[PDB]
Amino acid sequence: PEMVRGQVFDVGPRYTNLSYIGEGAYGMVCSAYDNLNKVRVAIKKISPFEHQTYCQRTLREIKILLRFRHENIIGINDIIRAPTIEQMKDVYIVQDLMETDLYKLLKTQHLSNDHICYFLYQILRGLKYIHSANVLHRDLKPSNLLLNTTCDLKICDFGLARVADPDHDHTGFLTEYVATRWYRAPEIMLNSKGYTKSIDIWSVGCILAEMLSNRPIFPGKHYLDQLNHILGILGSPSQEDLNCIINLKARNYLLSLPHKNKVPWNRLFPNADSKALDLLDKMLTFNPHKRIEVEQALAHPYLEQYYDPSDEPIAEAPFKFDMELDDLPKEKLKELIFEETARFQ
């Protein structure tokens, strides 16, 4: 029963020589050797059974990754668990090991324009597939963009992923959110639950900007501070953009603010490619309806080098409706997780 950093991993014997990777609220990631395929891999221990929300996240994640099959998206090789619902205390996801993530990379390395262009392509390529399955990742960030030595990119961490529900997007002003702050679309703060594809595009824009200068573009310190950062660069939203925000609290807040001028991208990123900045402008659009879509982003002159519609696959079977796990209790969600994982026993 090998243990890592005070956490015990019941994964043997197939997996040996464990090494720590990352720690999550209700999970932990480590590396290990797989004696049945003769290479080291990534193993994620998930202990979501004490909380209901975690059980929900876990079920959605497993279900999505199981269906998904794409070069730029992390898959599941195996799942380790107790043979009975009773003895199941943890769930272990086995996945391909990647050398590093973009977050770790941006901390220490300057990226060449060639690297930025290629990374962005693979992110959009993966995202095209995700969105084609009517799925929103909802938490894209450098830390869940994994890379290897040959600069291949894989998307991971589908904990907050959900089936898109555009019709049920509307919400009040300042409604709480779970996704990482720095990468939250401005609409989250004003009128959106983040149930539309456009929010993933905002995140990719923030990542592109971060790739450009190695610093987050909108590092807010709290819910509202995030909005101010965005507005401090994007400038005051126009009359047309305000007309799409009908809830009064949000609109009256924006109208209460002093006029702020747009900060020109070329001023923020003086070394950047001008086509890259043109695309960055389209991804980072205040109005979600005017925001560039993933397939449009791929066809952008900045990515002309890798653009190929034929080699940008889409999902064979899209997800129909979001699972009704909101009302489900821990115990029953323990049962569905058990069943979804039966195939690997």
Ligand X SMILES: COCCN1C(=O)c2cc(-c3nc(Nc4ccnn4C)ncc3C)[nH]c2C[C@H]1C
Active site residues: 139
Q: Which of 11, 18, 42, 136 binds ligand X (CB under 6 A)?
A: 42
Cα separation of 186 and 227, whole Å? 6
Q: Which of 64, 98, 272, 277 binds ligand X (CB under 6 A)?
A: 98
Phi-psi region of 46 (alpha: psi -120 to 50; beta: other; left: phi over 0): beta
Instruction: Determine, following the binding rule CB under 6 A, whether residue 187 of this chain makes contact with ligand X.
Output: no
Q: Which is nearer to ligand X, 78 or 241 (CB)?
A: 78
Instruction: Determine, following the binding rule CB under 6 A, whether residue 97 of this chain makes contact with ligand X.
Output: yes
Q: Which of 120, 153, 156, 161 binds ligand X (CB under 6 A)?
A: 156
Q: Which is nearer to ligand X, 104 or 282 (CB)?
A: 104
Cα separation of 192 and 104, whole Å? 30
Options 122-130, 140-148, 186-194, 304-312: segment touching ligand X (CB under 6 A): 140-148
Instruction: Determine, following the binding rule CB under 6 A, whether residue 95 of this chain makes contact with ligand X.
Output: yes
3 state SS of 174: coil
Q: Which is nearer to ligand X, 18 or 250 (CB)?
A: 18
Q: Which secondary structure element, helix H or strand E, spans residue 218, and what is its range?
A: none
Is 25 marked within a binding site?
yes
Strands 3-4 and 7-8, sheet pairing: antiparallel
Q: Which secondary structure element, helix H or strand E, spans residue 136, and what is its range?
A: strand 135-136
Q: Which of 7, 77, 100, 180 binds ligand X (CB under 6 A)?
A: 100
Options 92-100, 109-117, 252-260, 288-296: segment touching ligand X (CB under 6 A): 92-100
Cα separation of 147 and 127, whole Å? 16
Q: How many helices (H) and strands (E) does the chain have?
A: 12, 12
Q: Which is nearer to ligand X, 27 or 288 (CB)?
A: 27
Cα separation of 165 and 156, whole Å? 22
Q: Which is nearer to ligand X, 95 or 198 (CB)?
A: 95
What amino acid is encoded at 190 in this protein?
L
Instruction: Determine, following the binding rule CB under 6 A, whether residue 251 of this chain makes contact with ligand X.
Output: no
CB 58 within 8 Å of CB 91: yes
Cis preceding linkage at 13, omega within 30: yes
We find the least distance from the C-beta atom of residue 332 to ligand X, in angstroms, to be 23
Q: Which of 2, 14, 22, 282 binds ligand X (CB under 6 A)?
A: 22
CB 263 within 8 Å of CB 270: no
Instruction: Determine, following the binding rule CB under 6 A, whether residue 27 of this chain makes contact with ligand X.
Output: yes
Options 90-98, 199-207, 221-229, 324-332: segment touching ligand X (CB under 6 A): 90-98
317 Cβ contact list (under 8 Å, min separation 6): 67, 133
Instruction: Determine, following the binding rule CB under 6 A, whether residue 75 of this chain makes contact with ligand X.
Output: no
Instruction: Determine, following the binding rule CB under 6 A, whether residue 139 of this chain makes contact with ligand X.
Output: no
Is 3 marked within a binding site?
no
CB 4 within 8 Å of CB 30: yes
Q: ∠ CA(214), CA(215), CA(221), 5° rounding?
A: 160
We find the least distance from the C-beta atom of residue 126 to ligand X, in angstroms, to be 14
For binding to ligand X (CB under 6 A), which residues are involved? 21-22, 24, 27-29, 42, 44, 74, 95, 97-98, 100-101, 104, 143-144, 146, 156-157
